[PDB]
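#dry-run=false #mode=assembly
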Amino acid sequence: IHGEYAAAFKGKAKVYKVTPSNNELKLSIPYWALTCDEFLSVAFGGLEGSGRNALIDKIYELKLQTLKRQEYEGINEDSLTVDTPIPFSIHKLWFDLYRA
Amino acid sequence: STYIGTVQDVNGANIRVVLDGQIGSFVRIPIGYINLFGIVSQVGAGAVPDKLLEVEPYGHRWISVQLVGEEGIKKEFERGVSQYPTIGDKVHIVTEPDLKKIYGTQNKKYISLGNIASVDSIPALVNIDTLVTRHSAVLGSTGSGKSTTVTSILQRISDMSQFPSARIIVFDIHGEYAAAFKGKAKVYKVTPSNNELKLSIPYWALTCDEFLSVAFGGLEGSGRNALIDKIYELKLQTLKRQEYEGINEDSLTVDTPIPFSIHKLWFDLYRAEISTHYVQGSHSEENEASLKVVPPIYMPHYLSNRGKNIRKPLEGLASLLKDPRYEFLFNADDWSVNLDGKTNKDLDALLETWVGSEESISIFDLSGMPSSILDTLIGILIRILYDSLFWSRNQPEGGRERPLLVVLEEAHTYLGKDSRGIAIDGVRKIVKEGRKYGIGMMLVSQRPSEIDSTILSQCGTLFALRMNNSSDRNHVLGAVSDSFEGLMGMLPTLRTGEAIIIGESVRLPMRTIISPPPFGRRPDSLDPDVTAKWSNNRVQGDYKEVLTLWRQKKVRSQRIVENIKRLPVSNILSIGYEADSMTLEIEFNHGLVYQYYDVPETLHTELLAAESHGKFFNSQIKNNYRFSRI
Ligand SMILES: Nc1ncnc2c1ncn2[C@@H]1O[C@H](COP(=O)(O)OP(=O)(O)OP(O)(O)=S)[C@@H](O)[C@H]1O
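#status=ok
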C-alpha cells in the first residue's frame, strides 16, 4: 500500500499502479468484474431502501440486453445471475436511470 | 540389588529415607507378604528435605513414599493401601511379572490397543463400555499423533472377528481418514467419485430454527413469522394430499419432518411480492399479467398487496438454489423433491445408508463443504441421529442393544466458551443424556483452551499427546479426575505417536505407545505439493477456459472422455488410450486419473514395450502435452 517494493525488483516484477510509467502498467480493476453487493458498496456507499432494490433491476436488465446482443458460451436467460462477470456500461446505467 | 535408601523418619505422609529408576516408573516395596506399588515422583534432587539440607547440601539421596495401591492376598492389585510403609522397608525395582499382573486382568471387557514404554510386550488394556458410555477426547500438539492414533483405535475396535456388530460414526473435515480404510468403511463426500456416494442431508430433516439459521441468517422481523406461517400450510398441504401413519392435522408440529418442496414456496412466495394487478386492490393470483426458473416478464407498475419487507431474503434465497456448491442439500439426487412435494424415498434408507450399512465405519468428509455454514451443519448431524436413537431405544436397532460412538475432528473450533452456534448445544445434550441411550463421544482438537470448561471436564478418559504451549497444559491439568505428579510432569516432551490414557476407562493411567497401523493404511490428505508442482518448467496456459469454468460455475471441461476402458499394468496402476480422439487415460495410486490430450499412439506402443514404467513415463509425457486431470 506504500508502493515501496517496486524499487527492489528492477526487472523481476510486473508493478501495477495508478500513474502509468515507461514500462510499469497501470492497475486496472474492471468495474463490471464485481459482484452485486460489492459494486453497490464501492460506488454508492450503501443503499438500503428502494434505490438498492431499483438499481439491481437495472443491472439485471443491462446484463440481459448484452447477452441477447452478444454470445457468451453457457450463460442463458435462466443461468444468468446478477453477479456473473458479463460486461455492461456504467454510463448507460447512470444516464438512462438519471435521465428518466 | 540396586539398594538406594530405607525409611527412617515417618511424619504421617511426608516420609523421609536415608540412602547408602525412570521418572514415570513404579516401585517395588514388599512388606512381609504384601507388595506395595506406586508412583514415587519425588526422589533425590527434589526429594532432599529442606530442613536437613543445611547439614549436607552436597547430596540428594532421599525418597518420600506415598503409594497408589497395594497387592492383594495373591488375588490382584487394587487401588488404595491398608497400611503405610514404616521403618525397615526396602524399595526395589518392579519386575516383568509384576507389570503383567498389575496391568493384567481376567476380564474380557477390556481391549488391548497400545504397549507400555518399559517393555512393549505388555499390552495396554482399555475398557470399551466405559469408552463408549463415559465419553473421551484426544488432545496433542499439531505435530503429534492425533489422527494417526484415532485410526488405530477405530481399526482395532472395528475388528470383525471380535466385534462383528460394531457401529460408530466419524466426522472428518480434511477427509484425511478415507485412505486408511481403503474399502472397509463407508465414506461419503460432496464431490462424488467412482466408488463414493453423496454425503446428503435432506434439508426437510431440519427444525424450523435450523432451516431458518442456514438459508436466511436469522430473520428478526414480522416477516420471520410469516415464513413459519407459510411453511405450515405447505407442510399441512402435503399431509392432506399424501397420507402418513401416526400423525394427523390436530397434532401437526412445524418441527416434524414432513416432506415439502422448497421450490414451491419461493415461486409462490416471491411471485406474490411483485406483480401487476389488473384490478386495484385485488390480491388474487388470477389478476397477474414452471419447469425452469425463468420468471415471465411483467408490465411495469398495481403492485401486489400481499407482500412484506422480506424482499432481500427472497432474492437471497433464490441465489442459494443456483450455485452447485450446495447441491448436496437442496438438490439431493434421489431425495430430490418434486413440484408436488412427493419424494422418491424416505429417511429410513438414509439412516440405513449412514448407519444401516453392513460396514462398521461411517465417514463424512466435510472438506468440500462451505466453511461458512460448517458449524450449523455439525449440529444438524448430531441432532438427527439422537432423535433417531432416542425414539428407537426399545427397538432392536437402537443404541441400547447397539451403542454408537460419534467422533468429531477439531472440536475446539465448535466448543468455544462463548460460542453461540448449534454444535455446542447439540454436543452438550448428548454428553448429558446420551449416557443411558448408548451414545458415546470422542473429541479431537489441537488446542483445548478454546473448548468449554464444563464440556471438557465431563469427558471420561483423555488421550494426552505431547503439548508445547503452556496455556493448554494448565487447562487440561485442571480437568483431570485421577492425575499423578509423576505422569503429568512429562506431557510437553512425549515423543511422536505415544500418548497417555487417563480417566475412568482404565484401572490405572499409563503412558502407552499406540501401535502404528500397517503401512498403506494411514490417514492421508492429498493436498497439492508446491515443491513438486512448482519445480516443473513453465507451460503456456490457456486461460480462455479458466474464464468459462468460472462463469459457468462448473469444474469439468467439455473435452472429457467417459467410456474409455482400462487394463491393469511412479507406481503406475492402470492406463487407457483411444485413437479416435487421441485421448490418453492414465491412472496412478490413490485414485489419481489424468487424461493427457493430443497424444499420438506411437508412444502408447512404446510405453507398453518400454518396460521402464515410472522412470520412463516422465521422459516424454510429464510436461509435453495438454492434460485436464480428473
Ligand atoms: N506410531 C508412529 N510412529 C512413527 N511415526 C508416527 C507415528 N504416529 C504418527 N507418526 C508420524 O508423525 C506424523 C503426525 O501427523 P498426522 O499423522 O497426520 O496427525 P496430525 O496431523 O497431528 O492430525 P490431523 O487431524 O491430520 S491435523 C505422522 O504423519 C507420522 O509421520
